[PDB]
């Protein structure tokens, strides 16, 4: 009847410290290698790190610079603090007790997991670059790369909403730097490359930014 429980603010501010504790009920603080894991929404599982009740610490090198894990032997808990949080740290965090040496029947034991999101009140304008056709002479494709903007909703039009058929706006990615980038590509007949001009209209209202890019070969 072993049980792990996570606890902490499910919502947090950037450049603050992300705090999480895990209480262990029906288990010895010495019986496991107490670890923190996270999965960002969409991406895979990332082992944050592992701490032992004596103080033996082991940090993922990708996060070592800003992770500090602790253990409270009296309250039977163990904690995790993560400095310099960005939107890229919005993830589902879980405590587990990892069995380092296969010495326990029943294997590793896990908590229930909690989705911690970091809310930032800042903005950043997008950098817009054109994705040129490089003529293929047979329905070519040309686009707009919207890169490195923080607040999520941007809207992309083509020729101010005239060009509709063939518009495909791939969803934004969340880079490790905490900024978003997406691409909007259109498929146009090769004969129209030299005659018809194409301009994409990127609108990012949170930063009060509007950009129009003429995409020409």
């Amino acid at each position: 009847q072993v049980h792990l429980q996570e606890s902490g603010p499910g919502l947090v501010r950037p450049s603050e410290t992300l705090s999480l504790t895990c209480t262990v009920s029906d288990g010895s603080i010495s019986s496991y290698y107490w670890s923190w894991i996270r999965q960002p929404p969409g991406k895979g599982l990332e082992w944050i790190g592992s701490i032992y009740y004596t103080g033996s610490t082991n940090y993922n090198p990708s996060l070592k610079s800003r992770v500090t894990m602790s253990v409270d032997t009296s309250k039977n808990q163990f904690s995790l603090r993560l400095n310099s949080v960005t939107a890229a740290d919005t993830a589902m965090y879980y405590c587990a007790g990892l069995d380092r040496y296969s010495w326990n029947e029943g294997g590793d034991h896990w908590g229930q997991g909690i989705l911690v999101s970091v809310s930032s009140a800042s903005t950043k304008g997008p950098s817009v670059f054109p994705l040129a056709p490089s003529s293929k002479s047979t329905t070519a494709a040309l686009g707009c790369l919207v890169k490195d903007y923080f607040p999520e909703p941007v809207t992309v039009s083509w020729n101010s909403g005239a060009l509709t058929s063939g518009v495909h706006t791939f969803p934004a990615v969340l880079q490790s730097s905490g900024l978003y980038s997406l691409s909007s590509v259109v498929t146009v007949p090769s004969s129209s490359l030299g005659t018809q001009t194409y301009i994409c209209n990127v609108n990012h209202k949170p930063s009060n930014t509007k950009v129009d890019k003429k995409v020409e070969p």
Partner: protein, 214 residues
């Protein structure tokens, strides 16, 4: 940390048997045990297999693992609609101070429709971006089912360390999936190497595109 590689997608019709591969190095699978986790959205990973095909109580008999010299496999016989999840293999690693390494993950989908192979359009960095002391390659994937791929970038036929950001697959209008990946480079890195390649892997089909500065 030498990361454990997994096929991006494993599929089957109801009742079929589906196996998941997990490839590792000498420091992780050649010396430590392998665990298999069932990952559902908005919850914690459910531990399916530990200690090479031992499973805790509550895990049906339909799951079973096995480890080899440096490879492990999970087996899900009699696939059910309730088995759609992201499955991960994790193993300890005797690297610098001891690292818990996860597998890249494998999406298990019950066949709602025939499989669709992906399309790949690769875009090199614009001259305007190069003038801004920056470089970005855009790799667009579309029209594939189920919704899971592995995008691996190469520089002169050798794999790229960092700089890759990939979106999770998303369902478009015609019930197939799309996704994009980006490789951020400095202008010197772009002009230096002979080529750069975007390699997309999906259910035993591989599509690789390449662009060059010259």
């Amino acid at each position: 940390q030498p990361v454990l590689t997994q096929p991006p997608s494993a599929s089957g019709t109801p009742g079929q048997r589906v196996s998941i591969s997990c490839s590792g190095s000498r420091s992780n699978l050649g010396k430590n045990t392998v665990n298999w986790y069932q990952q559902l959205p908005g919850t914690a990973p459910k531990l399916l297999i530990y200690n090479h095909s031992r499973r805790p109580s509550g895990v049906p008999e339909r799951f079973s693992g096995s480890k080899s010299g440096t490879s492990a496999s999970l087996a899900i016989s009699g696939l059910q609609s309730e088995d759609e999840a992201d499955y991960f293999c994790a193993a300890w690693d005797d690297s610098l101070n001891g690292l818990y390494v996860f597998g890249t993950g494998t999406k298990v989908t019950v066949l709602r429709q025939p499989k669709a192979a992906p399309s790949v359009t690769l875009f090199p960095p614009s001259s305007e971006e190069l003038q801004a002391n920056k470089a970005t390659l855009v790799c667009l994937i579309s029209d594939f089912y189920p919704g899971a791929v592995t995008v691996a970038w190469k520089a002169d036929s050798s794999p790229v360390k960092a700089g890759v950001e990939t979106t999770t697959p998303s369902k478009q209008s015609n019930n197939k999936y799309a996704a994009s990946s980006y490789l951020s480079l400095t202008p010197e890195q772009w002009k230096s190497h002979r080529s750069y390649s975007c390699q997309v892997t999906h259910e035993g089909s591989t599509v690789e595109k390449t662009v060059a500065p010259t």
